[PDB]
From a paper:
Titin is an intrasarcomeric protein filament of vertebrate striated muscle that plays essential roles in sarcomere development, passive mechanics and homeostatic regulation. Tandems composed of FnIII and Ig domains are found in titin’s A-band that is an integral component of the thick filament. The C(central)-zone extends along the myosin filament up to the edge of the bare zone and is formed by 11 copies of a long 11-domain tandem unit consisting of [Ig-(FnIII)2-Ig-(FnIII)3-Ig-(FnIII)3].
In order to obtain a domain structure representative of group B and to expand the understanding of FnIII domain arraying in titin’s A-band, we sought to elucidate the crystal structures of the triple FnIII-tandems A80-A82 and A84-A86 (both tandems of type ABC) from the C4 super-repeat, which PaSiMap analysis reveals to be a prototypical representative of titin’s C-zone. At the domain level, individual FnIII components were structurally equivalent in both molecular copies. Regarding overall conformation, the crystal structure of A84-A86 reveals the poly-Fn tandem chain in an extended arrangement where sequential domains display alternating torsions along the chain path. Domain pairs A84-A85 and A85-A86 are joined by 3 residue long linkers that are largely hydrophobic in composition, having sequence NPF and DPI, respectively. Direct contacts between domains that could provide stability and rigidity to the tandem conformation are not observed, with steric hindrance between linker groups and neighbouring domains favouring extended arrangements. The copies differ primarily in the opening and rotation angle of the A85-A86 pair, which varies moderately between copies. An analysis of phi and psi dihedral torsion angles of linker residues showed that domain repositioning is singly caused by a small rotation around the psi main chain angle of the proline residue (DPI) in the linker sequence joining both domains. The [N/Y]PF sequence, with its bulky hydrophobic residue components, appears to allow only minor interdomain flexibility as revealed by a comparison of the two molecular copies of A84-A86 in this study.
Author numbering: 3 to 306
Amino acid sequence: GAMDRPGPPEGPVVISGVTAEKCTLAWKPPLQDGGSDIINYIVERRETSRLVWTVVDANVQTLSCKVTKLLEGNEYTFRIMAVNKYGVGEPLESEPVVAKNPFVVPDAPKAPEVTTVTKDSMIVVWERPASDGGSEILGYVLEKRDKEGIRWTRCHKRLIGELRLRVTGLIENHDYEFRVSAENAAGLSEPSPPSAYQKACDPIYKPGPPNNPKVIDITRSSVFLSWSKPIYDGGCEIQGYIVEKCDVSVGEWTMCTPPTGINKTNIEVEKLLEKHEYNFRICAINKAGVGEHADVPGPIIVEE
C-alpha cells in the first residue's frame, strides 16, 4: 500500500540500572515499519516538571540506550521514536523514574557461635551490624554443614527475625559448622565465616553436692557418716565420693579417702583423736571432676 513513517515502538519501556546519575532503557521494535526498514531510534528525556523534551541520542541502532547525566532526586520520563526513510514515528513513553541510588544488600555478618548443645540441638547466636549503617536488616538465613556432608543446608525456611536460633534435628555425635547471612530489602548478603565445628552430644558437668550428709554413730576413735546420691549428677555417672576431715583446733582439712574416692554412701572415719572436735566434708566424683562439697551438720566430739 502507500508508504509512511513507522509505528510506535512496542511494549512497556523497561527501565534498569537506575542510579543517581544514569539508567538503561529497552523497548521492542514497532509492529509496523510503514513499508521501509527502521534506520535508527530517537531517545528523549523530560524531567517531570519540564515542558521541553531533550534529546538523549538521535541515532540509536539498538533496542536499548544508556541514559547518563541524570540528576539525583529528579523524576524523569523517557520517550522513544522509530525513524525510517519517510520520517519519525509516534513515541513510546516510559513510566516516571526517580534517579536514586539503589539499595545495597547487607555486609556479610561476623561468624556465629554455638552456645547450648544437646545430642540433637544447638543454640546459635550472632551479632547485629556493630553500627546501624542503613542496612535495614529484615532477618537472617542460618546454614549448617555436617562434617561428613557435602553442602550447606538451611536450618529453617524464610527468615529468622532475631539474633539467635535453636537448631534442632541434629544427628547425635555428628559435627556441624554454621554460617549466617543477613537479608534486607535489596536481597541476601554474602555468608559469614563459619563457626568452629561442634559435636552434637549432651554435655557433662561436675556433680552436685551429696545429699543428706549425716552422722550415724560415734565411738572412742571413729565417726560413722552417711549420705545419699547428689540430686544433680551432672548428666554423668557418680563413680565415687571423697570424704575430708578437719580438727577444729587445727583447721587443716585432711583426706579420709584416696583421691579415687569411695563407692558407698557410708564411711567409717577411724583413728580420730579422742575427745577432739571435727567437721567432715563429702564430695561426689564424675567423669567431669569432683563436685561441690556437702558439710556434715555441726561439729562432732569423738566420744562414747
